[PDB]
Amino acid sequence: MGRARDAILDALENLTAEELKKFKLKLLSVPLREGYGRIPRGALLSMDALDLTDKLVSFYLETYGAELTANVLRDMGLQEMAGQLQAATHQ
Amino acid sequence: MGRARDAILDALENLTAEELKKFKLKLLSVPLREGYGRIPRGALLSMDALDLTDKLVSFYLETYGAELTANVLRDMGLQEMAGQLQAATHQ
Amino acid sequence: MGRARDAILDALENLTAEELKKFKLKLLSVPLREGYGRIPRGALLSMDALDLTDKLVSFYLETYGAELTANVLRDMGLQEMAGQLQAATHQ
Amino acid sequence: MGRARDAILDALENLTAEELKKFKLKLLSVPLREGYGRIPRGALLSMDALDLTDKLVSFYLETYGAELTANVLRDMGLQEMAGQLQAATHQ
Amino acid sequence: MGRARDAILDALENLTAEELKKFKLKLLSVPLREGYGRIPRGALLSMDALDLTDKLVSFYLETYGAELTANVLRDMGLQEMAGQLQAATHQ
Amino acid sequence: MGRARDAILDALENLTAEELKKFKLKLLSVPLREGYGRIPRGALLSMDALDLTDKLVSFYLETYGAELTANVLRDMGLQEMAGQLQAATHQ
Amino acid sequence: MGRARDAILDALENLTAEELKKFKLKLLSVPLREGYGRIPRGALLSMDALDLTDKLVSFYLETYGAELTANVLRDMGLQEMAGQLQAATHQ
Amino acid sequence: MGRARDAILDALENLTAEELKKFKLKLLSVPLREGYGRIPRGALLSMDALDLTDKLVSFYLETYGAELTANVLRDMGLQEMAGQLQAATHQ
Amino acid sequence: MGRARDAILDALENLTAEELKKFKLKLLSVPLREGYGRIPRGALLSMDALDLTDKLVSFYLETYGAELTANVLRDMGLQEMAGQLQAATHQ
Amino acid sequence: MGRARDAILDALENLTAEELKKFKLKLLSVPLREGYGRIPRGALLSMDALDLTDKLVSFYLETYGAELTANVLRDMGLQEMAGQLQAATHQ
Amino acid sequence: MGRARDAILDALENLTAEELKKFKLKLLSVPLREGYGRIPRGALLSMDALDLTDKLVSFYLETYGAELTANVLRDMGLQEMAGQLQAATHQ
Amino acid sequence: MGRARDAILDALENLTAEELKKFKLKLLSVPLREGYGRIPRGALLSMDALDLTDKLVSFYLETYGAELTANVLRDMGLQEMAGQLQAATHQ
Amino acid sequence: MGRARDAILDALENLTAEELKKFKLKLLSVPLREGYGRIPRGALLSMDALDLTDKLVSFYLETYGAELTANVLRDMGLQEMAGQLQAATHQ
Amino acid sequence: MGRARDAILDALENLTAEELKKFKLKLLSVPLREGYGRIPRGALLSMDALDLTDKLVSFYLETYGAELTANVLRDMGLQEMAGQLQAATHQ
C-alpha cells in the first residue's frame, strides 16, 4: 500500500461539512485529460471522505489524483493544505 | 448487440436516489405501445439501477426502452441527462 | 464538461440568507420557455445555494439556465455581479 | 390505468415538510365512505409522500383518492393546488 | 404562472417593522368570505414578508389575495401603495 | 371516530413558541384521573404541536384529552381558544 | 371573528409613551372578575401596543376586555378617547 | 383458524418502531401465569410485528394473548386502541 | 408531583428580564447543603425562566428549590414577590 | 423476574438526549466492583435508552444495575428521579 | 475590484445621524436611469451608512452609484465634501 | 480508570458556546510534543464538549489532556476554573 | 465559593452609565500582576456591570479581583464605595 | 502550524462590532496579487471574528494574512494596535 492513499485522505479530514459538498460538486466539472472517465453523479452525492478517497485512488492513480485534488483545492480558495499536500506528494 | 445497455447504464448511474424512485413510480403510469407489458408491482419497488436496465432491455428493445426512459426524463424536467442519452441512442 | 456550473455557483455564494430566499421565491413565478418544467416548491424551499445550482442545471442547461438566472438577477436589482456572470457565459 | 398517478405526485411535490405531515395526520380523521378501510398509523408516520400516493391509489381508486386529497387541502387551507389538481382529474 | 405573486412581494418590501406587524395583526381580524380559512396564529407571528406572501397566495387566490390586501392597506391608512398595487393587479 | 383529532389541532398553531413550551411544562404537573399515567418528560421537550396532539390523543381519550387541554388552557390564562374548544368538543 | 380586535388598537396609537406605560402599570392593580388571571409582570414588561392588545385578547375576550380597558382609561383621566372607544364597541 | 389471529395484529401496524421497541422490551418482563413460558430473548429483539403476533398466538391462545396485550398497552400508555382491542375481544 | 413546578413558575414571569441575570448569577453562588451539586454555569446563561424552573426542579426537589428561591429573592431585597411566593409554597 | 427492569426503564424516558449522552459518557467512568466488566467502547456510544438498558441488565444485576444507576444519576445532579427509583428498588 | 466601493465609504461617515435620514428619504425620489430599479423602503429605512453603501453598490453601478451620490449630495447643498468625493471618483 | 474523564468534562458545560469556540480554535494551534498527533479540525468544528473530551482522552491520555487543557485555558485567561483543574490533577 | 461575587455586585449598583464607562476604559490601562491577561476590548465595551463582574472574577482571583476593584475605585477618587467594598472584602 | 493563528485572532476581539463589519467590508475590496482569490461575500458578512480569522487562514497563509491585515488596519486608521500586531508578526 503506497503512502499516497494516506497523504491525501488526511487532507479531506480537516474540511467542514458545508465545504466538502461544495468540493464534491465542483468535482463534477473539473477538466479531465484523455483516457479518464468521471465518477457517476448518482453515486457522487453519497460519499463521505474515506470512501470518496477510495474511489478517487481507484479510478485515478496516486499521481494524477494528487495533482487534480491540489488544483481543485487551489481553485476553491484554499491553497494551505494544498501546499502541504504538494510537499507530501512530491516527497 | 447495441452497446446501449451501457448508455442506459451510465444514464441511470448519474442520477440519485430521490429521483430514481420517482423514475420507477412514473414508469407505472406512462403510456405503453401495443405488444408490450408493464413490469409487475410486486418486485419493481426493490431493484437497483442495474437490474432496472436489465429488465427494460430484456422485455423492451433498445430503441423502445431508451425512448421510454427519455420521455420520462423530460417528464420530470431532466433533459440534460435525456439529451446526452438521446445523443448516445440515435447514433 | 461545460464550465457554466463552475461559473454560476459564484453568484449564489455572494448573497445573504434573505437575498437567496427572495431569489428562490421569485423563481416560482418567472416565465418559462416551452417544454420546460418548474422545480417543485416542496423541494426548492430547503436546499442551499450549491444544491439549487445542481437542480437548476438538471432542469436547465448552461445556456437557458444562465440566461434565466441573469434575467432574475437583473429583475431583483443586481445588474453588476450578474454582469460578470453574463460576461463569463458569453466567453 | 389512470393517469392520476402524476397529478397527485405533482401536488405532493410542491408542498413543504411541515404541511405534508399535516396532510398525513389529518388523513386519520377524514370521513371515509363505504367499502374502504383506513391506512395504518405506524407505517405512514415515517414514509414519504410519493409512497403515500402509491398506497392511497392502491386501496382507494384514483378518483376517490383525488377528491379525498382535495377535501383535505380545502380543509387545511390550500385551494390553488386543489383547484389545479381537480382540473387535471375532472378533465 | 401568475405574475401577481411578484406584485404582492414587491409591495410588501417597502413596509417597515412596525408597519408589517400591524398589518399582520389586523390580518387576524379582517372579514373573510365563505370557503376560505384563516392563517393559524402561532406560526404567523414568526415568518417574514416573503413567507407571508407565500402563505397568503396559498390560502387565498392571487386575485382574491390582491383585493384583500388592497382593502386592508386602505383600511390601515396608507393609500399610495394601495393605489399602485391595484393599478398593477387590475392589468 | 371523533373529530377531536383536528378540533384540538388549530388550538396549537394559533399559539406561538413561548407559550407552547409553557403548555407542555404545565402538562407535567396537571392532575390526572385514575387509570392514566403521565407522559414521559424526555419526549415532551422535543415534540412539536402535531406530535403533541398525537401523543395526547393516543394516551388520553379524545374526550378526556379535550377536557385536559381545556383545563390547562384556561389555567395558563387563555380562555377564548379554550372557548371554541369547549364549543366544538362539547358540540 | 369580532371586529373588536381592530376596535381596541385604535386607542393606543394616538397616545404617546409616558401614558401607555402608565396604563401598563395600572393594569397590574386593577380589579379582575373571578375566573380571570392577570398578565405576568416580567412578560408584560416588553411588548408594544399591538402585542399588548394581542395579550389582552388572549386573556380577556372582546366584551370584558373592552369594558376593562374602557374603565381603566376613564380612571386615568382621559375621558373622550374612552368615549369613542365605548361608542365603537357598544355598536 | 380463528379470526383472533387477525384481530390482535391490527394493533401492531399503528405502532411504530419506538413504542414497538418498548412493547417488545416489556414483553420480556410482563407478568406470566402458571403453565406459560416466555418468548426467547434471541429471536425477540430482531423480529417484525407480524411474526410477533404469530408466536403470540402460538405460545398463548387467543384469550390470554388478548388480555396480555391489553395490559401491556395500558402499561405503556395506550389504552384507547387497546380499548377497542378489548371491546372486540369481549364481543 | 408537587405543584411547586407550577408555583415557582409564575414567580419568574412576574420579574423583569434585566433582573433574571442577576438572579441566576446569585444562584450560582448561594450556599448549598450536603449531597447536592451546583448548576453548570455555562448552560444557565442561556436557559430561559421556564428552563431555569425545569433545571432547578431537576436538580433540587420542590421543597429545597422553594427555600432557595425564597432566600435568593429576599436577598436581593424583593419583599413582595418573596412574600407571595412563600405564601404559595408553605401552604 | 425483577420489576426494576421496568423501573430503570422509565428512569430513562423521563430524560432527553443531552443528559442521556453525558449519562452514557460517565458510564465509561463509573466505578466498577469486582467480577464486572465495562460496556465496550465502540458500541456504547450508539444505542438508545432501551438498548443500553438491555445491555446493562445483561451485564449487571438488577440490584447492582439499579444502585449504580442511582449513584451515577446523583453524580450528574438529578436527585428526585434517583430518589423515586431507589424507593422503588428498596421496596 | 474597483476602489469606488471604498471611495464612497470614507465620504459618508462624516454625515451626522439626522442628515443620513433625509439622505435616505431623498434617495427614494432621485431620478433613475432606465434599466435600474429603486431600493426597497422597508430595508433602506433600517440600515446604517455601511450597509446602505453595500446595497447601493450592489444594485447600482459603482460609477453610476458614485455619480448619483455626487448629484444628490449636491442637491441638498453640500459642495465641499461632494467636491472632494467627485474628484476622487473621476480620477 | 482515571477520574480525569469527569474532571475534564465538568470544566466544559460550565462555559458557554462562545468561549469553547476559541478554545477548540486554539486547540488546533497549541504546541504538541513529539509522538502525538493533532485532532482534525473538520470534525472538530461541529462537536460538542462531550465528544471533545472523548477524543482528547482517546488521542491523549488523562495526564497530557489535563495539562494541555490547563495551559490553553490559562492562555485564554481563565486561571481559576483551570485552577481547580490542576488542583484535581496533581492531587 | 467566595461571597466576593455578591458584594462587588452591589458595589456597582450606584454607578451611573457615565462613571462605569470611565471605570471600564481606565481598566484598559491599569497595571496587572504577572500570570494574568487583559480583558478583550470588544467584549468589555458592550458588557454590563454584571457581566463585567463575571469576566473579572473569571480571569482574576476573587481576592485579586476585589483588590483591583478597590485600587481602581481609589484611582478615580471614589472614596465611600471603595471603602465599603474593601471593608466587606477583607472581612 | 505557525502560531499566527492566534496572533491574528487577538487583533479581532479587541475591536468593536461597529468596526469589524466595515473591516470585513474593506476586505471585499483589498488589493490581491496573483494566485489569491477573494472570500465569497454572502458567507463573509455572516461570520464572527473567530470565523473571520478561520477563513483568513483558510484563504491566505500566515505571513500573507498577517501582512494584509496589517495593511488594511493601517488603511482604516487605527495605528496603535496595528503596530502592536505587526510587531508581533515580524518578530
CSV table of C-alpha atoms in Angstrom, one decimal, chain D residues 4-87:
chain,number,residue,atom,x,y,z
D,4,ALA,CA,-53.9,10.4,-11.9
D,5,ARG,CA,-50.6,9.0,-10.7
D,6,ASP,CA,-48.9,12.1,-11.9
D,7,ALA,CA,-51.1,14.9,-10.8
D,8,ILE,CA,-51.2,13.6,-7.2
D,9,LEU,CA,-47.4,13.4,-7.4
D,10,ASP,CA,-47.4,17.0,-8.7
D,11,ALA,CA,-49.5,18.1,-5.7
D,12,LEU,CA,-47.4,16.4,-3.0
D,13,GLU,CA,-44.0,17.6,-4.5
D,14,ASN,CA,-44.7,21.3,-4.2
D,15,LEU,CA,-45.8,21.3,-0.6
D,16,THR,CA,-43.4,21.7,2.4
D,17,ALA,CA,-42.5,19.2,5.1
D,18,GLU,CA,-44.5,20.9,7.8
D,19,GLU,CA,-47.7,20.6,5.8
D,20,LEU,CA,-47.2,17.1,4.4
D,21,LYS,CA,-47.2,15.9,8.0
D,22,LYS,CA,-50.4,17.9,8.5
D,23,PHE,CA,-51.8,16.2,5.5
D,24,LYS,CA,-50.9,12.7,6.7
D,25,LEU,CA,-52.2,13.3,10.3
D,26,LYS,CA,-55.4,14.8,9.1
D,27,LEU,CA,-55.9,11.7,6.9
D,28,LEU,CA,-56.5,9.8,10.1
D,29,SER,CA,-59.9,11.5,10.8
D,30,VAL,CA,-61.2,12.5,7.4
D,31,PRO,CA,-64.6,10.7,6.8
D,32,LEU,CA,-64.4,7.6,4.7
D,33,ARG,CA,-67.2,6.1,2.6
D,34,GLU,CA,-68.2,2.5,2.5
D,35,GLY,CA,-66.1,-0.4,1.2
D,36,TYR,CA,-62.8,1.2,2.3
D,37,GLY,CA,-60.5,0.9,5.3
D,38,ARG,CA,-58.2,3.5,6.9
D,39,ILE,CA,-54.4,3.4,6.4
D,40,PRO,CA,-52.5,2.1,9.5
D,41,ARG,CA,-50.9,4.9,11.5
D,42,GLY,CA,-47.5,3.4,12.3
D,43,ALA,CA,-46.4,2.7,8.7
D,44,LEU,CA,-47.3,6.2,7.4
D,45,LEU,CA,-45.5,8.1,10.2
D,46,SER,CA,-42.1,7.6,8.7
D,47,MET,CA,-42.7,7.1,4.9
D,48,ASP,CA,-42.7,9.8,2.3
D,49,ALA,CA,-45.3,11.5,0.1
D,50,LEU,CA,-44.8,9.6,-3.2
D,51,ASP,CA,-45.3,6.2,-1.4
D,52,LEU,CA,-48.3,7.8,0.2
D,53,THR,CA,-49.7,8.4,-3.3
D,54,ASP,CA,-48.8,4.8,-4.0
D,55,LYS,CA,-50.9,3.3,-1.2
D,56,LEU,CA,-53.8,5.8,-1.5
D,57,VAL,CA,-54.1,4.8,-5.2
D,58,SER,CA,-53.8,1.1,-4.2
D,59,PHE,CA,-56.5,1.0,-1.6
D,60,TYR,CA,-58.6,3.9,-2.9
D,61,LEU,CA,-59.4,4.3,-6.6
D,62,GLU,CA,-57.8,7.2,-8.3
D,63,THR,CA,-60.9,9.4,-8.5
D,64,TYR,CA,-61.9,8.8,-4.8
D,65,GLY,CA,-58.4,9.5,-3.6
D,66,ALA,CA,-58.3,12.6,-5.7
D,67,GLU,CA,-61.3,14.2,-4.1
D,68,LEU,CA,-60.2,13.0,-0.7
D,69,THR,CA,-56.9,14.9,-1.1
D,70,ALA,CA,-58.8,17.9,-2.4
D,71,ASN,CA,-61.1,17.8,0.6
D,72,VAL,CA,-58.1,17.7,2.9
D,73,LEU,CA,-56.5,20.6,1.1
D,74,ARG,CA,-59.6,22.8,1.2
D,75,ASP,CA,-59.8,21.7,4.8
D,76,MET,CA,-56.2,22.6,5.6
D,77,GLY,CA,-56.3,25.9,3.6
D,78,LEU,CA,-54.6,25.1,0.3
D,79,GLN,CA,-57.0,26.0,-2.5
D,80,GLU,CA,-55.0,26.7,-5.7
D,81,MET,CA,-53.2,23.3,-5.8
D,82,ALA,CA,-56.5,21.6,-5.1
D,83,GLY,CA,-58.1,23.5,-8.0
D,84,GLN,CA,-55.3,22.7,-10.4
D,85,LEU,CA,-55.3,19.0,-9.5
D,86,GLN,CA,-59.1,18.7,-9.7
D,87,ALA,CA,-59.0,20.4,-13.0
